Amino acid sequence: RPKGYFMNRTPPAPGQSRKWEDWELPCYITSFLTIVILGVGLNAKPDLSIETWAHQKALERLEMEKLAT
Amino acid sequence: VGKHIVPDKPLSVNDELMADTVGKYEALAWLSGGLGFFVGLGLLAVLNDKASKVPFTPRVYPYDNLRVELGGEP
Amino acid sequence: GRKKGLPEFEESAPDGFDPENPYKDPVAMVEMREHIVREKWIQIEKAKILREKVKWCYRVEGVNHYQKCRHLVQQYLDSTRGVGWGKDHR
Amino acid sequence: LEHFCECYFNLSGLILCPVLGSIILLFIPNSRIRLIRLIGLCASLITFLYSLVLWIQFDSSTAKFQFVESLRWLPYENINFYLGIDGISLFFVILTTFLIPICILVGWSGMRSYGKEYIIAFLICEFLMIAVFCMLDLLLFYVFFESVLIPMFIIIGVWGSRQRKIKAAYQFFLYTLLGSLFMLLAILLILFQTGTTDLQILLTTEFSERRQIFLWIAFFASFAVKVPMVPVHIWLPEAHVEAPTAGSVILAGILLKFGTYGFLRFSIPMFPEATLCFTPFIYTLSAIAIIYTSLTTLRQIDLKKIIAYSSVAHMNLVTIGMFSLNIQGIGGSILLMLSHGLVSSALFLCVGVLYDRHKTRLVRYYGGLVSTMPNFSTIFFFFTLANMSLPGTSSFIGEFLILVGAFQRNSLVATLAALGMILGAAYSLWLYNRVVSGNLKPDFLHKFSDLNGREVFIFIPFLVGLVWMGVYPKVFLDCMHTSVSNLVQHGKFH
Amino acid sequence: GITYKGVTVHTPKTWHTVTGKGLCAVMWFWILYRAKQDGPVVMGWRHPWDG
């Protein structure tokens, strides 16, 4: 077995399971929501950045002034 | 390692921060002499004027010394 | 709710702006500032596209880039002078 | 004129959340520790999630204040007030909502002796701070900022560690009050001209050059005590060191940002001519502070005094970038603000871990902790690197983008500011090696414990935050550029 | 190993002696050969295009 214990907690009695402290469940649920709200939300929101708009506008103005003269 | 020394006397103010045989300003005097060697040789290179003693002419390249190939106006 | 698509803005400068007196029409002064920002961003992206051409010209032409990319370099350098908010005013 | 927003998620509910938490806790018996703790933690977490949703519905194309909503004060409707955010303030709200639950989690083990008074104070701080970040009025900004002094005073004085907390809290309250009073004088000066204190209006009113200079000096005095700027920076060391760990986290991660945010929200846009005339003056004070306070940090012997002294150097780099008045300067200044609010808080968290076990802040007592606390040592080293603006970390992104912005305006200030790289690395590595490296000193310390499960979880969002902004800062820069661009263009028409 | 008033020096292993001898020998043969072909050229007596 390894030396020491992960995060310095003694293992529970054999056959039993560790008791979760009160903060663990609300923090773990929020962490999952934080990943889903940002991982899916940021990728699903429209790309309304000014750079994206101006890049399209720059392509057409360069097109209109090159095709014309 | 073996035993860290617990202070038994009042600590000095510059204790958080605290070259044996040669003094401070003497070391600077010696080092300036060494840097004076580099300066002296540089002056000899000035007086040697190896630029005035080149045994070949400068290269002359074709097509206007590569004017167009070097980014000059066609 | 917002409709799907890219943002749309008026292409022309707001009528009602007076260059001699900008603190006269409050609404136009604001829409004019927004218009100028959008126009400057078009120039920045204009130069950025010109920068990409120079990049791949250098990569494709190798040691023949000085004679072959001469024109693209000139265009790109001209666009970066008086671009964005850097070392040139206007 | 009612400006109520159509969005379901708005600023009002985010404001109300911690208020509701505080009102609920006042009535719960102190005998019910488990319930008090869970109520506070859940309220703070819900607020953080709400702020993330506010981020989701953000428009990065507009320069107009978003989610704008109004609240009436009188039935005469002469004085009406507005709430709204933009690309400049959104991330500060999200940071406030992220840091408050951390503060509740830090004192989890001692909440038997803290009580509801500890959770209530931090929730009230959260509510006031979000309000301050969400205001479109000079007057409400003053009230809510001046109001944050009472809970911070209580937090420092009651849960501070030693009797030096008395002097520290006194100095904090008095310095901040002086600055706020100067701001109040400026707000009344503006009101006498305009008849109103509405940001959207004063952005459209021209101020005379002489009055621009005078209004700038009164706004400067207020903001420069909170930056902090030399020589009114000396309250910060005592205040940040003597405070409890969560108190230090709030003080350095959020409260320090109010002055630089006040420069970006009010002083810079409203007085564009005054801003230009004072840029060399700002550059001198900022550059002196970076060089002087970094050398002072080198010779500090207290763990918390070193970390707190480091913030003064970082905030004065932020002022340099924001007064460069270009995209790289202002965008870099905001990014360093948020990154500092993460790195400084985590570093205060690392020292708090050590002080909770050993009850000493003197560097000489520690040493050789790598052999007894390797997990703490690894986490301490990462945040030590992030404090040196190492590429890959979030703080490098803000630091370099500011140096780019400063270089295009004044090469000399960029060179003096870049000396922060040499000095910042010197004390950061010296601190890390004197604490973690070397041999143990069993005469001083012979009993150790690495980080527990709660301490490990506390650091994880900090580690993810710095790496995320460090390698892919585009998610932040995308949502800021339109507001940043319109801030730089304000006042000129060519 | 061979002992001489207390000090003992163990004999090096066979492939360590062989490899050391061989690799240096290849180097000597390399130098004598390259001196055969380029010694005249670098000494300036002749030119690579002479013939």
Place this chain on the structure above:
Amino acid sequence: KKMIATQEEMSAAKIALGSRDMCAHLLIPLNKCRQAEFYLPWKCEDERHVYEKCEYELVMERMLAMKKIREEEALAKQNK
């Protein structure tokens, strides 16, 4: 020695700008095998030797040219 390799031919052989001298014509077949023979020193010895003979004569000519110039500075000096 007159230019034999035109600008297009040197541009087509991607010749380094420093090697567009008067022996550009003998460099093209030398570089063509160098890529073909993996730049091995014991290959292209024939193509290498013709090219090196060129670049040596060009230097000698420019050495002879400077000798005449050196012999003219002394003429001015003794006629001072």
Place this chain on the structure above:
Amino acid sequence: GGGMETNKNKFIEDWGSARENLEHNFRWTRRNFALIGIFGIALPIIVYKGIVKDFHMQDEDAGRPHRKFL
């Protein structure tokens, strides 16, 4: 023997408390007049003039009159 708290050292703690109370020992000596004169007034002024001159040189480099400041 017991307890995680550090075993305080009177000389280390006296060293520590001396640092926190440095303003009590400040006497206007000749050394302090010079240090405050050189590094509290003179050096900030020199830096400010170098920064302003940097702008002015940019002004003449661009064919524009010197920018007024302060």
Place this chain on the structure above:
Amino acid sequence: GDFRAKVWSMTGGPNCRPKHWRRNTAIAMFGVFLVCIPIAKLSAKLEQRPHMPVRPIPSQIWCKNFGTKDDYEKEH
């Protein structure tokens, strides 16, 4: 030493000799090869070779981005 046996570290600590280190090592080798799979496909999709090589190369099999940047006036 003595107390280091009660200290947990990710790197294993001094004199780490796990009993099943071979099966652990091979499980690590299978994992890294698995992670090397998506990296290769992304690299082959992202590689850009403006010039056709003088001879066929291993990458002319898994990569299809050869001689495609010739019209650099159209780059945007």
